[PDB]
Amino acid sequence: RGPIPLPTKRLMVTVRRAPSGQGYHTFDHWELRISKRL
């Protein structure tokens, strides 16, 4: 009939911010949002 906003596909990768775990445990939120219409 018309456009329809199907719910977006969200992709998460929480990754530790350290190349050897020295220090506080800081984490990186990596996001790749996908929108789908119809």
């Binding site: 992709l11 990768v13 990754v15 530790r16 911010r17 190349p19």
Partner: peptide, 29 residues
């Protein structure tokens, strides 16, 4: 093992991404 090197440590198989978790922060964008 990885994709931008071979390291085996943090292999990651989330989805289908094969990266060492150190390279991935550098190749994420």
């Amino acid at each position: 093992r990885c994709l931008r090197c071979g390291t085996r440590e943090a292999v990651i198989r989330k989805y289908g991404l094969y990266l060492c978790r150190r390279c991935f922060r550098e190749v994420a964008p």
